[PDB]
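batch job 7 of whatever, protein = beta-spectrin
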Amino acid sequence: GSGTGAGEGHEGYVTRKHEWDSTTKKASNRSWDKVYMAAKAGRISFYKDQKGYKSNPELTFRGEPSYDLQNAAIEIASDYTKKKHVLRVKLANGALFLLQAHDDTEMSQWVTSLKAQSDSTA
């Protein structure tokens, strides 16, 4: 773009897996979600649509959460069949924000964004 967006991160309707603390899977069993994410590695912001957003700017689809993490780190999957085109920044609270983007130019730009933010220092 040209200036700053809404908050501080990269934003697209993608399939991300925010903050985690579960280990149910075995064969598969979905866990991630596909919503309108507005997060990166500086702060998180979540909305499925402009719904709770329609009503009040603090509420959204109940998968509404948000963060402030210029502390987190960086990682890429590279060990899957679908999630092997994903990126992930890791906070210091056990959670990870995974990113399965749509195209490839945004997916890498999610890593471009995300990497610049997660582990900010100088």
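notes: The CA atoms of residues 70 and 120 lie 5 Å apart.
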